[PDB]
Design a protein around this ligand. Sequence first.
Ligand SMILES: *[C@@H]1O[C@H](CO)[C@@H](O)[C@H](O)[C@H]1NC(C)=O
Ligand SMILES: *[C@@H]1O[C@H](CO)[C@@H](O)[C@H](O)[C@H]1NC(C)=O
Ligand SMILES: *[C@@H]1O[C@H](CO)[C@@H](O)[C@H](O)[C@H]1NC(C)=O
Ligand SMILES: *[C@@H]1O[C@H](CO)[C@@H](O)[C@H](O)[C@H]1NC(C)=O
Ligand SMILES: *[C@@H]1O[C@H](CO)[C@@H](O)[C@H](O)[C@H]1NC(C)=O
Ligand SMILES: *[C@@H]1O[C@H](CO)[C@@H](O)[C@H](O)[C@H]1NC(C)=O
Ligand SMILES: [Cu+2]
Length: 153
Amino acid sequence: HFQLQWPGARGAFVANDEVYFCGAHNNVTTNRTDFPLDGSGFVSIKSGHAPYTVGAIISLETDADAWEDFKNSSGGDQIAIAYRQVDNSGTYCVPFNPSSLNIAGIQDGANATIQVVYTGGDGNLYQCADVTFRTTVANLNSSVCTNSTHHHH
Ligand SMILES: *[C@@H]1O[C@H](CO)[C@@H](O)[C@H](O)[C@H]1NC(C)=O
Ligand SMILES: *[C@@H]1O[C@H](CO)[C@@H](O)[C@H](O)[C@H]1NC(C)=O
Ligand SMILES: *[C@@H]1O[C@H](CO)[C@@H](O)[C@H](O)[C@H]1NC(C)=O
Ligand SMILES: *[C@@H]1O[C@H](CO)[C@@H](O)[C@H](O)[C@H]1NC(C)=O
Ligand SMILES: *[C@@H]1O[C@H](CO)[C@@H](O)[C@H](O)[C@H]1NC(C)=O
Ligand SMILES: *[C@@H]1O[C@H](CO)[C@@H](O)[C@H](O)[C@H]1NC(C)=O
Ligand SMILES: [Cu+2]
């Protein structure tokens, strides 16, 4: 199981609820995180165990409230972060530039939802972050952006 560190999840973390769409926070939120388009952005999570596979899908719907809202026109998932295996528990953090996705409406002021998709052997698990894309963002605290390492797993 895992928590989003930055950008922050839609609502209160409930481990049991991670099996549901957006961790059972189905409704979009209005307290969105400003997320930079200048290439300084990242996604940071914390996993309780490893190994696991993680990726993220994205919705450019302001009201993203179902799986459909994360699919492209041909009905495939809009992948924001490609799936990979992670071999250490604790913090995992990937740079994320939304400008690098070929998705319409990625621009200053655009609303989106990033859904992290996690598989670590105890189910398919989900958490969502509601963001607003901005050209630049003031005072981005990058201190959560590290990869933990464990000599003995
Ligand atoms: C938005 O507000 C909800 C409910 O108050 C809160 O639980 C959530 O953590 C907030 N989102 C962010 C990114 O802080
Ligand atoms: C939360 O989701 C429920 C069920 O879909 C919906 O009826 C309700 O209006 C939503 N509330 C908000 C605050 O979006
Ligand atoms: C994006 O979300 C914010 C915060 O809820 C909202 O005020 C704004 O009007 C939305 N923008 C669009 C284009 O829907
Ligand atoms: C839809 O997303 C899938 C991956 O989930 C991708 O292979 C496909 O090219 C996309 N379709 C379009 C219309 O771009
Ligand atoms: C960044 O957040 C950390 C806690 O994670 C805190 O110690 C620090 O004050 C923050 N950095 C700035 C410049 O505010
Ligand atoms: C974490 O490791 C991944 C490779 O899995 C790498 O792409 C990423 O840049 C690393 N993040 C940090 C903060 O070093
Ligand atoms: Cu778990």
